[PDB]
């Protein structure tokens, strides 16, 4: 798994969890900084090279903008992300 | 904890999880029958007397109607229930 793919995967889950928290009424999720830490922890558990938290934050903010600007209806977004992120959310808890 | 309170607590979590699944885009939750089984399992873990699944189903349907007919805005409902049910959802998974 390349460093590029590692960053992309962790940034994707962080961005999606932030979107759920902010836009899909997932008030059980923790604050953005804690979501970032949880994504770093997923990487650490896999034995991945140390991922810089600020690089993760920058990439995750770009992916969050992508999820926001996409014109898919919000209910469809929220349904998809709640399903796709269920494993990540179990880890962060 | 009285039998009445046991039934009410389990029916409440079952009803709320069904509401999340149906009305709050929680497509990661399982089907109604599995939600009912998961609520029975919460009771079993606590050592509670065997709760009849059909009585649980009947009471949970009444509580679900209550959650539906309440005039609180849906975003507020979904936010509250996602927070309150997070422990139950961790058990069912």
Curated annotation (Swiss-Prot), chains A, B:
Task of the protein: Involved in the secretion of pullulanase.
Residues of the full protein shown: 30 to 122 of 125
Record's keyword terms, sorted: Cell outer membrane, Lipoprotein, Membrane, Palmitate, Protein transport, Signal, Transport
Family of this protein: To E.chrysanthemi OutS.
Membrane topology, from the record: Lipid-anchor
Name of this chain's protein: Pullulanase secretion protein PulS
Transmembrane segments: none
Gene name of the record: pulS
Gene Ontology cellular-component terms listed: cell outer membrane
Native source species: Klebsiella pneumoniae
Main location: membrane
Classification lineage: Bacteria, Pseudomonadati, Pseudomonadota, Gammaproteobacteria, Enterobacterales
Entry's localization field: Cell outer membrane
BP GO terms, sorted: intracellular protein transport
Keyword Lipoprotein among record annotations: yes
């Amino acid at each position: 798994v390349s460093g590029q793919a590692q960053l992309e995967q962790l940034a994707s889950v962080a961005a999606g969890a932030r979107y759920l928290k902010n836009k899909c009424n997932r008030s059980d999720l923790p604050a953005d900084e804690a979501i970032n830490r949880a994504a770093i922890n997923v990487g650490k558990k896999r034995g991945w090279a140390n991922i810089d938290a600020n690089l993760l934050s920058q990439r995750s903010a770009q992916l969050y903008q992508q999820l926001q600007q996409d014109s898919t209806p919000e209910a469809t977004k929220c349904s998809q992300f709640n399903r796709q992120l269920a494993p990540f959310i179990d880890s962060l808890r």
